[PDB]
Design an enzyme around this catalytic site. Structure first.
Site, PDB file in Angstrom:
ATOM      1  N   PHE C  32      66.517   3.160  65.754  1.00 42.44           N
ATOM      2  CA  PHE C  32      67.858   3.743  65.771  1.00 42.44           C
ATOM      3  C   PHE C  32      68.200   4.449  67.252  1.00 42.44           C
ATOM      4  O   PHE C  32      67.163   5.128  67.786  1.00 42.44           O
ATOM      5  CB  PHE C  32      68.002   4.557  64.783  1.00 42.44           C
ATOM      6  CG  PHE C  32      69.502   5.398  64.972  1.00 42.44           C
ATOM      7  CD1 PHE C  32      69.486   6.503  65.695  1.00 42.44           C
ATOM      8  CD2 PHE C  32      70.649   4.973  64.254  1.00 42.44           C
ATOM      9  CE1 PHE C  32      70.823   7.313  65.852  1.00 42.44           C
ATOM     10  CE2 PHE C  32      71.827   5.554  64.335  1.00 42.44           C
ATOM     11  CZ  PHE C  32      71.847   6.723  65.135  1.00 42.44           C
ATOM     12  N   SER C  98      60.135   3.267  64.701  1.00 44.14           N
ATOM     13  CA  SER C  98      61.165   4.160  64.102  1.00 44.14           C
ATOM     14  C   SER C  98      61.491   3.664  62.851  1.00 44.14           C
ATOM     15  O   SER C  98      60.636   3.354  61.847  1.00 44.14           O
ATOM     16  CB  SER C  98      62.298   4.361  65.160  1.00 44.14           C
ATOM     17  OG  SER C  98      63.142   5.282  64.522  1.00 44.14           O
ATOM     18  N   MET C  99      62.867   3.354  62.740  1.00 46.69           N
ATOM     19  CA  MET C  99      63.333   2.684  61.592  1.00 46.69           C
ATOM     20  C   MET C  99      62.418   1.376  61.297  1.00 46.69           C
ATOM     21  O   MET C  99      62.379   1.035  60.146  1.00 46.69           O
ATOM     22  CB  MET C  99      64.605   2.477  61.659  1.00 46.69           C
ATOM     23  CG  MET C  99      65.888   3.665  61.717  1.00 46.69           C
ATOM     24  SD  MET C  99      67.484   2.887  61.419  1.00 46.69           S
ATOM     25  CE  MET C  99      67.445   1.983  59.950  1.00 46.69           C
ATOM     26  N   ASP C 228      56.516  13.699  69.907  1.00 50.44           N
ATOM     27  CA  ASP C 228      57.462  13.094  69.223  1.00 50.44           C
ATOM     28  C   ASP C 228      58.289  14.263  68.699  1.00 50.44           C
ATOM     29  O   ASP C 228      57.936  14.776  67.682  1.00 50.44           O
ATOM     30  CB  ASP C 228      57.012  12.291  68.181  1.00 50.44           C
ATOM     31  CG  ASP C 228      57.848  10.841  67.785  1.00 50.44           C
ATOM     32  OD1 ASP C 228      59.242  11.349  67.358  1.00 50.44           O
ATOM     33  OD2 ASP C 228      57.638   9.795  67.889  1.00 50.44           O
ATOM     34  N   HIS C 257      59.487  10.417  71.542  1.00 47.71           N
ATOM     35  CA  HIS C 257      59.511   9.614  70.396  1.00 47.71           C
ATOM     36  C   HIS C 257      59.819   7.897  71.016  1.00 47.71           C
ATOM     37  O   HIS C 257      59.518   6.974  70.224  1.00 47.71           O
ATOM     38  CB  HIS C 257      61.143   9.499  69.859  1.00 47.71           C
ATOM     39  CG  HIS C 257      61.049   8.864  68.402  1.00 47.71           C
ATOM     40  ND1 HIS C 257      60.370   8.737  67.551  1.00 47.71           N
ATOM     41  CD2 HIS C 257      62.569   8.288  67.838  1.00 47.71           C
ATOM     42  CE1 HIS C 257      60.894   7.913  66.553  1.00 47.71           C
ATOM     43  NE2 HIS C 257      62.175   7.794  66.867  1.00 47.71           N
TER      44      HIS C 257
END
EC number: 1.11.1.-
Lengths: 440, 440, 440, 440
Positions: C32, C98-99, C228, C257
């Site tokens: 995202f 991530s996602m 992160d 991140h």
């Protein structure tokens, strides 16, 4: 709007094109790292001149697919070929910019100028960028180009801002010849491109186009900016001018690499004038050839001189009143009605303005084809073939297979607005008709 | 998601639309030079209210095709028509903004409110922008609009930043009612649009919609910002309000032209309230439509008067004892069993309380459909379609394709709790059933 | 490039994917609110390592459709499954970010690692983000996530700049590890996404993947940045490492991140090394399968051992002089000419350097296909199909339909540089040829 | 209603049949010298149980054609065969009486129980009537049968009154178990028959069916009257019971030869009970077969056991709340959405009551089939074939030809009431779908 030009894995390689307006097709090939929309300054100009503008985005750029294969001018040309053949363009004009000039030259060299009527090279790559011992006219050595690719690979997004700084000569033209917003759009377009194409494209800039140039036979144009930082005027266009002296040469003073926007005024004027001169050029070689065919059915005398004089007068631009000519034509003694019809058919075809003059009666009765149903049945069959024809030699030679009575009827078939063929085709039908008469 | 609405030479004109949610279809037509995505503030609101949001981008804008032809409201409406007819929308609501308001007005005027249930005009162009001697209510003279087109043609990218400055009243609303980033997105959307459309669109703003307004029969809404700089409140909406007094009028105090984002709070509240009142309005119009259809299958007499009166009583709110009505209904001479079944199905639907009354026996045997297996097989196929329907006109028109025997059986199929459909859909089945019987 | 994975009303849910390179398939699932193009740092690296990079945009992001329904990992996995099953990938690698890490875990958990060879979790969500009483290892409480959704719904465009500010740790890395232009592009990508997806996605971040982890049987990789901010190293990866000790664990020092760009150097090195162990395994199993097919047409003897030995030598990396191998091959008694051609065709395919060796004469005359036009007509028809093929099993099985004379000719058709197919496909043609010979 | 089963030089051999009711087809073959209408006591009863009653008149009897050729059980079975195949009956039960029992045995023996599910022998002829040295179990010597034929040939009309006196045992049952009027009708029916058939039929009574009996594989029933004068209980049914011990044996106390009318009470009870056990038999064999296929796509674990347990519970009769199962099913981790859809589709099919529960949402989105238009186009074509199917094995095997994505979509096509097929067919579609998933 897309056009499949290849295949990559599960995916197919599609190129976003764009075809607008109606008239003589003008294909516009863009440069690095923009897209077809970068032509918008020229697009409007060409459209306002009644041309048919066709633009497409190169693979890995704009809205085209972004493959990781086929980044060479042999492929770039193959792509252009598919586009031309898919749209089935005839008497088309190829206008290239930056990378685009390479696509044009390579296509002409490899595929031939069958569909091409004229070419234009704006900010050319030709003949050879790579600087070597055997090619001292090269702009830069191998090391330079390798540096660009590495620069792109590092941070392509950051590369663009620096790239566009010399692309438009922003230290000179920003705020004046090119707005801040206009540059921002160019950056977005650069980012929208494929990451792989962005790094792959620079290696294609130093392609050897020297072998391609001699294949350029159609009328050409070489325009270039003196202030071109990316492609130095002396290492590119001026040495290109020597390799192609027949080409019309234009040097825009103090124009950057992206003169398409900064100097759109001059570029449009030069491009429009060139297309005008090329259209007129091929038209005049056509008209004079038609003339000799028409004269071949006229008995040698003082009347043949008058007709030849009136034909040369209209062909040149000495616009005689169409009403006056037709009036003169009908009232001519010792002239076959069929010949009057052929002449009247030619005069209506060539005279620029119809001046609201209705189709002359004496021509219709001359090209009626004796009113015989058989003559018209043959005429329709011929007209069907002449519709899919676009070239003079092509239309003329397939017409010689039909009887002189059928050809005359088919001519009136077009004269009476019952049929539609391109002017070049119509001339072929006229010349084919005159050839039948010249035998008897 | 695209929808072909035309063809432009080799290419086809496709419009990128978007259909989300489930319920009453609400079409949102955007303005210049944004896209359907600009409705995102309203889209979310309508979706949270259970509506069906349908948005599309105008030709030469957003993700739609960018042709160089057909930039007039006759074409813009024709485009809208194709969208509506392709999705086969029924009881739909048309909401327009800026240019969008013109499409709504023109469509209603030309194609009629067959599929339309209500309309809304946000930041209207109506009735006439062009300022002339015969039209002193015009906002600006001809010279003004010609100046805009020239400005766009010069540098459309530079034009946008200036345009958006008065579009959102940034000297007032920037940082508060609209973020810096939000504007940046709007600019990108403006740049993404067609270069030709950008210059063509302004000429369509001064379209004469005076002839279109009287054709508006469906419930309307007129919202507008007082601080609208592009479209002055007095030269646009206030004079529009005079030509259409029946329309719901809303003036957002101190709202710019792009109130869709800056004053999304107010716009949502007004629109949601408007859609609630218009749907409720047509529902009352629905019950009366049901009555006339039911009466159309009842033989004229003193009994027909009683039946019509008992329908009016339950529709109004004079809750009669459901058991009493059913008792009276069954014990009626000179009344077809099928008619008793139809009436009984309506009475159960309309009476607010079921009062623990079990499904009437005389109704089941009336709508059983002769016990024919074939009639029920047709009924199930219809029931399947009626489940995905939510609107009256939608359910009614697709039911008219089935035989009268299947419709009667399908009605009892719902009566026996074997099926569940919204009240509007059920009414659609009733009106469709009565329509078939009235023919024989 | 799209892949239908669902439907929403009138529109269809399509996901923009991208498949490049040839070799071991590596699927890259983004996070995202970016898209597949964000993998470009890894994509280029993986492509240079001979992998087949496959990237796709999640629903509501990038160039994929933007539905307003189905934003959950059960749906996200169903989408990925459709992608995988459509491309029919085998021995594939799933890399998530991530996602993306969630999609990987859920797919493995629900659908099983039938097609999967290995998995990788970069900046993991696992095992659980939501901080509760039963899950004290959670990163943040419910209120935190609810706050993000409210922020996005408020002004998603303004939200992005703030989001990206902690996504790359710009207070540390801007200007150094990530350029200004690079962030600007990421913002544009974030804006291009669906308005609804932007608000829906955060609610999916605190999905409970604890039940999913035990289903991971294939070799796994857990990479994460210590710095992160979005996903704290201790609340995510370190507790994930405990639930999966067998997985290779990598902590990038001082990485934000978005380590995919800022620390691409380390990420590539770690990812490539992990993948390297897997790539060689499937590569050797292909060559040995080719070997056994080649040996299947060689008469049993001391010669069969030598050929098998010389094949293993080149397969391993003990590059023998290509000229020497060819020399030994031709001068072999008791060896069919067709067999010499097949061997010669394989040796040229496998040997890393072509060493400027011109195409061997004895091979061309071996694969000429009797000079029969009929054999070549079949070969051309077969070559046309082999061009669109990418897989060994795929190319091999469609080649078995053609005659042995056609296969031999088609082989030489490629040998003479008249045709181009991927190495895996060419091997399929060889194995298909050897299979025909093994029958007689 | 007739059915051509043969040909005569000018006439065609047509047999008057009769097909009523809907459900499991039950073919009723009458005896000598009556017709299908004699089953009226059984016909009415079977129809009340929801069966499909099919009766037909044997050649030379009732309303069937009356040929003078082909009076043997090899032809009689061939006739029956033509009847069954023309109606394309599946999972049918053959019930025979008197002569009829021979047709059942002969058909099953020669053509096989492909279409047959079960058989019943009322007042059997089996195994052999003719009394000889090798068959001492024979009812009567040759002279007896020859005596009957001569009696019929003498005066068939007078023969009937004497025949029916022993057919119904009128000395006991007249006035009580069979009315005077009932017999009078039978005589008329006997007279309406063909004169030649009346004399030819007796010669067929002593047919050797010993070779046919071992071919009986389907569940069988043997009913017979103790007071049967025409066919002695010991010489027919009791020795048949020894040759077929697996068959259900029923002896009606004090019943004559025509127990179909006199003891209709008992015959109905035994026949209905037998058909109930046979109908349930294939249903239980189906449910267990579906279970193993469904479990074949569920990952081995503690969850697989629970699902298997819940399937056994609903199949048995332990009706669990349908809403509870669906609630439990949806909230299951580590379970593919497609698997959840398949399970949900099965649970709705098997649970006796739907309990007014609307179609589950999670099932619809699971069986949508990716929303791909191609998947639905395949689904509809498959659905067309599944409509004309009635059998599990028949529907399952023709479904295996379609892709797994099409099968999943076709399943949801039926779940959403968009399609209607018998329960057996739907199960076939389920098992065919599960079979495709078990492969990958």
């Amino acid at each position: 709007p897309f056009i499949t030009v290849g295949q990559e894995n599960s995916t197919s390689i599609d190129l976003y094109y764009e075809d607008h307006g109606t008239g003589t097709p003008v294909v516009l090939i863009h440069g690095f790292p923009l897209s077809g929309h970068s032509w918008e300054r020229q697009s409007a100009a060409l459209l306002d001149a009644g041309y048919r503008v066709i633009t497409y985005d190169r693979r890995g750029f704009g809205q085209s697919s972004q493959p990781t294969t086929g980044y060479d001018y042999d492929t770039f040309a193959a792509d252009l070929n598919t586009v031309l053949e898919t749209l089935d363009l005839q008497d088309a004009v190829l206008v290239g910019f930056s990378m685009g000039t390479g696509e044009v030259a390579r296509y002409v060299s490899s595929y031939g100028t069958a569909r091409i009527a004229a070419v234009a090279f704006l900010a050319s790559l030709e003949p050879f960028l790579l600087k070597t011992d055997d090619n001292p006219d090269g702009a830069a050595p191998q090391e330079f180009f390798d540096g660009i690719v590495a620069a792109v690979k590092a941070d392509r997004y950051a590369f663009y801002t620096g790239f566009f700084n010399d692309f438009y000569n922003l230290d000179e033209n920003l705020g004046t010849r090119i707005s801040e917003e206009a540059v921002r759009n160019s950056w977005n377009t650069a980012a929208s491109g494929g990451f792989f194409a962005a790094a792959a494209a620079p290696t294609t800039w130093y392609t050897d186009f020297r072998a391609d140039i001699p294949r350029i036979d159609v009328p050409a144009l070489i325009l270039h900016g003196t202030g071109d930082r990316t492609l130095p005027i002396e290492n590119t266009a001026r040495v290109f001018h020597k390799a192609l002296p027949s080409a019309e040469y234009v040097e825009v003073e103090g124009a950057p690499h992206g003169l398409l926007w900064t100097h759109a005024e001059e570029v449009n004027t030069a491009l429009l004038a060139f297309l005008a001169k090329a259209q007129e050029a091929q038209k005049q070689k056509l008209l004079t050839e038609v003339e000799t065919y028409v004269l071949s059915i006229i008995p040698s005398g003082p009347l043949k001189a008058e007709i030849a004089q009136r034909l040369e007068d209209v062909f040149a631009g000495k616009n005689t009143d169409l009403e006056v000519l037709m009036e003169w034509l009908k009232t001519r003694p010792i002239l076959s009605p069929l010949t009057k019809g052929i002449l009247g058919f030619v005069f209506t075809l060539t005279v620029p303005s119809e001046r609201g003059l209705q189709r002359r009666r004496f021509v219709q009765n001359a090209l009626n084809g004796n009113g015989d149903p058989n003559n018209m049945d043959k005429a329709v069959k011929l007209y069907r073939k002449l519709k899919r024809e676009i070239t003079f030699h092509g239309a003329k030679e397939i017409s010689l297979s039909y009887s002189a009575g059928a050809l005359a009827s088919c001519m009136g078939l077009i004269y009476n607005r019952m049929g539609a063929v391109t002017t070049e085709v119509a001339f072929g039908l006229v010349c084919a008709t005159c050839e039948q008469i010249a035998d008897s």
